[PDB]
Design a protein around this ligand. Structure first.
Ligand code: BGC
Ligand code: BGC
Lengths: 822, 822
């Protein structure tokens, strides 16, 4: 069973029923203002920060799900329906929802009236525009009233949902029926005090009426599906005082057969300078100038269409950096459109706001934003350069860091814990990737404060040395890095020992002492320590580089000596010094993360893919045999069936979910990449397909979530719900798969001085072409691929054969033709 | 005009319609387990802590309000309806909700089936029991299937609403269709790990079938009001795995004409010792002994009836301490039933969990629980004793205190602020009222820690001296006490100067320095300073008592010299030493708190009610002229129309709401008592009537909220919603009005050495009889009352006239007959 289809030419996913297994959403906007838009028009908008500047209210875990969004009630001769289907659920003759790049279009038709809404966030605007086209599709004239509807939230979503004792008395609006381009409603809660910002909701016509009070619009004892006002057929002209402000206009339209009318609605976010806050000397009336300017920019359909065409050109431009043409259209749509689009969204949202993340506790993750950069750097490197500075600024002088920062303020906080010892290294990961991509070595000289302290700036490079040294000076008795609160796995809490309910493993106090070490961090360190060494040698820091390589060698020696179980890598040593992830325990025998990552670091790699004796092969075969399911690879096996007090959160999940035997998808690309490292492209591609949206569209009823984006987790073999995903959209899986497919499968990756072309995808993709713009030159890379295990590529460049797989960077403006034979 | 009526003989409020202005609730339970129950079965239940151990989920700000609670869907011939009206909203032939003392009955009849549900929490039990009675009222045999419905919360309410990324994978249940007494469902989320507790939802019958998974029971795209399972007339026998666990059983009923059946449903909270959590060695099956025992205790109608009678007897015995028989039945029902019931609820809940307080951030307020004692000490003094020790234990060594504590742990926290300088004196208030009531002088020698520090214990009396000394040593330039974060008005934040949005004033960092002083804390110091000196005298501390009265005197002199504005008392001095609440300012010229409280402390009292020269009289007259309204006295006049950065949170509310021009009811009884102190009984009683539930029942459509309990705030004169209440049930208004009316109007009040009988209620209650049990003896107080302004009482006791108005305490077991003439 499927619920829609990809449309590669329009770069859309087309949903053909409202009856999906779950609400399927798109993200609007890519700059500073964002909207979550479901296929039923549900969701909300915020400016910069989903907790602190949320414009409109949304209910997570509503009954039913997703009843709450931007609605347009049509009253046609007393019959009331919404083209989004929800909330009225009147029978529709046609329904369709198209999610595209930065816009969606939702169409519903019933009894000869077709209503189509195009939704998007324009470039350079802090606003969500809707363009509504109403068409008479019957053979008689029609007269209908359209009631727009949005529910405001009081800015601070946390306060909005818990602090009624205060907030039910503060709701404030103004109403401007006869504005310069049509009618507007102004939501200005707290603008009388410290807020310099307000929201507008307006339409490009003089409305017949309005409502700004939820209770009046909907009616006592009514859900949104039963709203009184649209049923009555006329606006109640309600002016809110406290309670629940809304934005709503009514417009009556008369249409002859085949005739249509357009309407443009804007929900905008505005700020004024402090001394330009008020229209009047008494400071009672809001200064509407920036709201009138905004409404003036979307007063016509023409203005809307121009914006939508610009947004398209922005996306075409964005997608011109990496693309592929092959015999596999699933592969292609993922690589050309969707995985890149998703990577923009994760770069913007980190893990804060989705239909699973609530946009309250989580801000921008230190580890999360660094990893996202890996799939984002080729898109817009100037924005990646900024993000690195923002991130490194939340670093402490001892090289440890705040685990996340608040998007509005860019200041770090401990709301989801502190002292994750894998954090510091991801910074090196992010800078290495950015430099390989852009060649912008000057970033290493950027002055960057610790903990945003004015006057504490040092060069970025120095933050990396802090990161590196943090791990050097925090190893345990085996030479492996101390784990601290948790490593890459948030639920491996080895310093916790909590027997007190209700307090979060993420924020709860940890024990000083013990000897808990992480095999994962060991690998991470070998990988990014080597990169650090490379940056040091290039800054001209010979002793530093030398010293750095001595430490890397030591730590990799320790992985081989103390971090190997026999058929796989060990996961860790607990508080007590006992091994975690050994065949000597009955549960949690093998954990996936060090298998993927130690192999990417090159640890235990042998002569080739057929070297059954190499540790890397052995590890990967164990991952194949014990962790493999048709939905991907589970995190560990077997899952823990009882609470293991020494391991923290991990065994708190029922088997087969999240970190206790779920397919935690973001560690899957590591095994994929590893598999290419040992020369088993076939298997790597196999693993790629198990978790990839386009190959799972065909089991939409099982996956349940959006079929065009990666999800955080898919229930494992031990779950009753095996195969069903949770937490879609916001996940490091997106950037990690992008890195996997674009760089190791298809094999095109930037290095410092050239572009590496090293295909390893197996025989399912026998021929394909990649166009990669790197350092202002275009590389047209034509691959003939036999997929033979261990077969690695040879190159010709502009007709001459070359040595190895690195193509030195041509000058800006050239086109370089690479012919690849595997 | 009205939506129901009082039933005095029954001690119930009878709601005669589903269509009330807002949801109107009762609180079930008075010990450690509590239920919020709207007159449509909405709300939820918790054990000890509304945030930490919430059994069942409830959505604030739902659309519509209060779609969600304890539902019984009846399916008769495919017609589906609920006796609570919501969620299904089927037309009922008959509907009625009776809210009583610790129980409620809700009845709905439709097409020949009457369904009545009695809800209560039994004494000694952590459970909510429902006894369902279905009656066939038609002339022919009838059949139906009943579906019970409750929605589980995942225990931590904060987590339940914000952390779906984790918690959608942790919901776990057990199904027990053939238990010892009928069918039961177990909610056991996190029992796997740190929780030693689970919930049960069971019925005294072998159910036809069950459901535990919300989406299956309700169906996709459906609201509660459209649940699929009841509509199909058959349970789906769903076994939840994550997502949203519910409890539901189906039961088939057959009824001859006139015949009824009882079903008993139980929602229970159960714990096991750690060593007996599990029924099996594998640890997958919860040990059910306690649940089987609880279900056995309510297996029959008889067991239910006996518990309901024990509950009635408990309430009769609680209400036997203070009673009045008078010419005014509204005054009688308030004093005899409702205001005492409300005091029980506030003692138990503080301000944490109502239909407006969301039972997340607020625990047990230091100041609020001290004031709640004033209204509660006469009901159950033993628990008042315990409360004082729990409270005093969260005090610091310098005499300042944690502003609130967490109900589950009894540990103080700062989640809603620090350093409110009025806090320490409330401790003296609470103890004095406890000692006056009980005569338990030995509580002062109770050893009490600071901040629960093992080894830090001092006698309770030392805590009081720490409080007393905190004020003496924290005065400013005018001799008035420094205000700190705020005083009793939380919105008066004179050390704030916040220009930054999104941070609670309550919680935001305060400024060092400045000279901000409170006139309210001065009048509070004067009153309770004097009470402390008296406690010191009794203990033999003549040195301490004399110094103490000296300070009280210094402060009293300071208020007359530096806190008097001309026609009323001054409110404060701001950070820079500018007066607040002076007639020299255009806004907030007069504030109510110091007016009632200074006069309660006897500041500015003259020769009598007609001593026009006296500050107290000038102050009270100005309160009357400038703050008075048909709905009560507003906090200050005029309201602030613009943000006053130096006053903090107060000017942030729009005019006429909450602290900015609202009737903040809990400060009205001070003015009442003040009016009695000064001899203006008529005026005092007037004010009493303006804010009292019984006297406002006639305007239910205007008050909106429950007509049988006090609310926090009634929208004031300057607000478009003037007369509309918010924040019902949980307010110090209840303790303070009970004080006012029981002790100062009717005039019956315990002193240290005898019972004072000092009526001051004016001419509208010419005669009444108070029955007061004090110190083991019963006082029968027969009052004949001219009401003459200023006229005070003379007494005769057991046939003999006496001097003054204090009847020294007679022995336990006596009945003393006091004849009173005013
Ligand atoms: O923290 C609780 C306090 O919050 C303020 O926002 C309200 O105005 C007060 O009435 C309340 O006591
Ligand atoms: O704080 C965020 C973390 O919460 C944990 O409870 C989850 O299992 C993790 O997957 C998540 O990253």
């Amino acid at each position: 069973m499927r619920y829609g289809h990809f449309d590669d030419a329009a770069r859309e996913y087309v949903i053909t029923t409202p009856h999906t297994p779950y609400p399927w959403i798109n993200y609007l906007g890519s700059e500073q203002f964002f909207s979550l838009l479901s296929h039923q028009a549900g969701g909300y908008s915020f400016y910069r920060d989903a907790k602190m500047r949320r414009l409109t209210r949304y209910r997570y875990n509503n009954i039913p799900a997703d009843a709450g969004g931007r609605y347009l009630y049509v009253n046609d001769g007393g019959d009331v329906w919404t083209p989004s289907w929800l909330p009225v659920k009147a029978d529709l003759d046609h329904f369709e929802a198209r999610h595209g790049l930065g816009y969606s279009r939702i169409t519903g038709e019933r009894n000869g009236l077709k209503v189509e809404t195009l939704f998007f966030v324009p470039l350079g605007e802090n606003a969500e525009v809707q363009k509504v086209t109403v068409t008479n599709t019957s053979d008689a004239p029609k007269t209908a009233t359209l009631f727009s509807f949005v529910e405001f939230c009081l800015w601070n979503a946390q306060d909005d949902q818990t602090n009624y004792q205060r907030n039910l008395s503060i709701g404030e609006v103004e109403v401007e029926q006869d504005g310069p381009h049509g009618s507007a409603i102004y939501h200005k809660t707290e603008y009388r005090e410290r807020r310099d910002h307000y929201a507008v909701f307006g339409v490009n016509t003089r409305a017949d009426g309005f409502d700004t009070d939820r209770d009046t619009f909907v009616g006592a004892y009514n859900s949104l599906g039963e709203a009184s006002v649209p049923r009555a057929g006329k606006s109640a002209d309600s002016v809110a005082s406290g309670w629940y402000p809304i934005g709503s206009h009514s417009v009556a339209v008369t249409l002859q057969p085949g005739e249509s009318r357009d309407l443009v609605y804007v929900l905008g976010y505005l700020e004024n300078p402090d001394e330009e806050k008020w229209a009047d000397d008494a400071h009672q009336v809001v200064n509407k100038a920036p709201a009138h300017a905004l409404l003036g920019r979307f007063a016509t359909s023409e203005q809307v269409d121009a914006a939508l065409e610009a947004l398209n050109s922005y996306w075409t431009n964005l997608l011109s950096t990496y693309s592929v043409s092959s015999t596999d259209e699933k592969l292609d749509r993922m690589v050309n459109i969707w995985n890149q689009y998703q990577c923009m969204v994760t770069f913007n949202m980190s893990r804060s706001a989705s239909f699973f993340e609530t946009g309250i506790g989580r801000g921008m993750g230190f580890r999360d934003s660094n990893q996202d950069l890996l799939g984002f750097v080729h898109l817009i490197p100037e924005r990646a350069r900024e993000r690195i500075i923002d991130i490194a600024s939340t670093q402490f002088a001892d090289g440890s860091a705040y685990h996340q920062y608040q998007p509005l303020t860019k200041r770090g906080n401990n709301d989801i814990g502190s002292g994750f010892n894998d954090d510091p290294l991801w910074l090196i990961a992010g800078v290495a990737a950015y430099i390989k991509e852009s060649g912008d070595w000057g970033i290493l000289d950027e002055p960057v404060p610790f903990d945003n302290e004015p006057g504490s700036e040092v060069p970025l490079f120095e933050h990396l040395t802090r990161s590196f040294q943090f791990t050097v000076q925090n190893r345990g008795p085996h030479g492996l890095p101390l784990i601290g609160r948790a490593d890459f796995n948030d639920c491996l809490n080895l310093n916790c020992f909590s027997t007190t309910p209700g307090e979060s493993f993420q924020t709860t106090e940890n024990q000083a002492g013990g000897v808990a070490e992480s095999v994962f961090i060991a690998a991470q360190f070998v990988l990014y320590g080597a990169e650090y060494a490379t940056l040091a040698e290039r800054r001209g820091l010979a002793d530093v580089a030398t010293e750095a390589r001595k430490y890397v060698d030591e730590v990799r020696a320790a992985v081989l000596e103390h971090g190997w179980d026999g058929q796989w890598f060990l996961r860790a040593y607990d508080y007590y010094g006992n091994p975690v992830g050994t065949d000597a325990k009955p549960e949690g025998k093998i954990w996936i993360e060090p298998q993927g990552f130690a192999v990417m670091a090159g640890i235990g790699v042998g002569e080739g893919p057929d070297d059954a004796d190499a540790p890397a092969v052995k590890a990967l075969d164990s991952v194949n045999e014990m962790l493999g399911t048709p939905h991907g690879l589970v995190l560990q096996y077997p899952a823990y069936t009882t609470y293991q007090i020494e391991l923290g959160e991990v065994s708190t999940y029922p088997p087969g979910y999240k970190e206790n035997g779920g397919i935690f998808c973001h560690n899957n690309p590591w095994v994929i990449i590893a598999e290419t490292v040992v020369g088993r492209g076939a298997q790597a591609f196999d693993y790629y397909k198990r978790i990839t949206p386009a190959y799972r569209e065909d089991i939409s009823d099982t996956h349940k979530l959006e079929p065009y984006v990666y999800a955080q987790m898919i229930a494992g073999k031990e779950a009753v719900r095996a195969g069903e995903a949770k937490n879609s959209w916001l996940t490091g899986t997106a950037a990690w798969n992008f890195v996997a497919v674009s760089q190791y499968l298809l094999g095109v990756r930037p290095d410092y001085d050239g572009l590496v072309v090293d295909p390893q995808i197996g025989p399912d993709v026998p021929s394909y072409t990649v166009t990669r713009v790197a350092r202002g030159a275009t590389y047209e890379i034509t691959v003939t691929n036999s997929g033979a295990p261990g077969a690695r590529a040879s190159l010709t460049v502009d007709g001459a054969p070359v040595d190895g797989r690195t193509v030195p960077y041509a000058p800006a403006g050239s086109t370089v033709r690479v012919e690849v034979t595997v």
